[PDB]
Design a protein around this ligand. Sequence first.
Ligand SMILES: CCNP(=O)(O)OC[C@H]1O[C@@H](n2cnc3c(=O)nc(N)[nH]c32)[C@H](O)[C@@H]1O
Ligand SMILES: [Cl-]
Lengths: 112, 115
Amino acid sequence: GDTIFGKIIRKEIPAKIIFEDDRCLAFHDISPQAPTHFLVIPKKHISQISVAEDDDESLLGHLMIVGKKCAADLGLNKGYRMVVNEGSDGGQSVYHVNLHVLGGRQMHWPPG
Amino acid sequence: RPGGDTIFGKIIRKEIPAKIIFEDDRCLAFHDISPQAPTHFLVIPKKHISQISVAEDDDESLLGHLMIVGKKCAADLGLNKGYRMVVNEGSDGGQSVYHVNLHVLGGRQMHWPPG
Ligand SMILES: CCNP(=O)(O)OC[C@H]1O[C@@H](n2cnc3c(=O)nc(N)[nH]c32)[C@H](O)[C@@H]1O
Ligand SMILES: [Cl-]
């Protein structure tokens, strides 16, 4: 089923977009948990990482490379944390694969 | 040496023991020595990359492979209620071993924010 991230990709509702290409979108999280907190999502609707296919490998890696480049562009030179949540225990809030990138503060351990 | 001389390079070359879950030509999955959840393991590339901020464009497939292997291992380990994947970059990220590593944590409710 469609999600709010689908609406964002289709530009039906606003988001603060950081980067776009033909296969992904990066935008600031509406509920930021760090001074910088954005998401990188594929345009392909993969509901969750547990159902990602083998053929999706380089696309998932693309999310991480885009995330790393956006983090550098946003000035996160002291570092950052990347997170993917799966399901209930993972605290996944939207069933559209999304890579969190958080920084601008010390991230702590355990990671939730 | 292939893998570098971080603790993870030693583990890749079987010079230091680890509890291995999965191994192929591109990566290694093994349990974390200081688990932060009832199940907590790591997926690392065999190719040494110090941190995600210096990964090359051509590392895309490899990085994605870490996640695919991570999700497959999580299923094999019975993490049916879900899990969290984490990559830490640098000081603010809390990185402690400068060899790229993906954490997979499950077997309990993970909380928000993720640290
Ligand atoms: C926040 C932790 N820093 P990181 O660089 O993101 O992750 C490094 C992880 O490697 C783990 N570590 C560090 N040393 C070892 C080890 O010798 N054997 C195993 N199996 N794991 C080991 C450590 O507990 C930590 O969670
Ligand atoms: Cl989520």
